[PDB]
């Protein structure tokens, strides 16, 4: 019954608040809609009549998140995984600490941060002594060896 970027109150076609800004009070026949900015850690990404700004995403260090792009009054924080942490989904929503590779297995491919340590059976003639996310299968040196001992 009205235009885009407007809403209908009391048969009055009121303006919505622009992105960046939240509704403080509705228009009247004599007053425009009253909008104020969102605080530093909040945002509002649409033409709105929302009274509480969305909180920016917290990039929690305790879930392997760190800030990538910082929030604005119009846009959310974007997070990403810290070094040492990879995405649990191809839609990186939370981060798992890079897995390591137990003895008798070596390292095919080191963790990306959008992918986990890829891990390979140490073939006959090769061993891994310990568990790390880095060290690979090594040969037995010349003086028995096992998948895990020289």
């Amino acid at each position: 019954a009205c235009r885009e970027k407007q809403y209908l109150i009391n048969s009055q076609c009121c303006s919505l608040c622009q992105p960046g800004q939240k509704l403080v009070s509705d228009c009247t026949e004599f007053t425009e809609t009253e909008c104020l900015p969102c605080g530093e850690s909040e945002f509002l990404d649409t033409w709105n009549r929302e009274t509480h700004c969305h909180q920016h995403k917290y990039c929690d260090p305790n879930l392997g998140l760190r800030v990538q792009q910082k929030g604005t009054s119009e846009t959310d924080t974007i997070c990403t995984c810290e070094e040492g942490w990879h995405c649990t989904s191809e839609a990186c929503e939370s981060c798992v600490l890079h897995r390591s590779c137990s003895p008798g297995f070596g390292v095919k491919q080191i963790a990306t941060g959008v992918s986990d340590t890829i891990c390979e059976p140490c073939p006959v003639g090769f061993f891994s002594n310990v568990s790390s996310a880095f060290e690979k299968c090594h040969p037995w040196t010349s003086c028995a060896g096992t998948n895990k001992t020289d």
Partner: antibody
Amino acid sequence: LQLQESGPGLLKPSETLSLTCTVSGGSISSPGYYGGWIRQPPGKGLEWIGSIYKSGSTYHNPSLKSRVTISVDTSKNQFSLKLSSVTAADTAVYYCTRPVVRYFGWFDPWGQGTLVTVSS
Amino acid sequence: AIQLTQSPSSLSASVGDRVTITCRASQGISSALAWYQQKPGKAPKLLIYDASNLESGVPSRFSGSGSGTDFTLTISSLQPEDFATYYCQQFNSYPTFGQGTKVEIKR
């Protein structure tokens, strides 16, 4: 645009309640898309549990402080609720909904509702 | 929390009769009132938003009015499929609903 609640209809005292709301006929990614949880003890009134913007930002009834987690999964087009340490008091029909113009409402559409009974 | 008190809480009425339900807010809530209709075993169904805007699809016999502290939902000719509980809710602050108003049909 429809919403379906899914979860268990029976749950023990002290267990945690886990419900999921599946959105069809529209994407939760659109600007302005919120989700909300309302509930209704049998033959009693309505209480808002909380709302969530697709961002993940969220508000909830102060009367469930430290018990409510509400989450959104853009990828699967679902949003969720966890209510910890449940009691007979939380037996109810739980509804997911679309807060339309802000966190606080109004609510349209709703889902069918899924009854949750808290019982040994 | 903003309390909403609906009057009455229950009523019998005849087909064709006019029924008004009121919703008093404990504080001013501007125009941010909505009304829902709930049929048994079904979810609330939006009738009215922003106090007086009637939801697309809903019959015109249903109308909304009021501002600040006092609101009314009016049914100008009760049909039998109107048996239901009616609820107002406010979204000026964190959401609260009234107790509901049960509507029976006298026949």
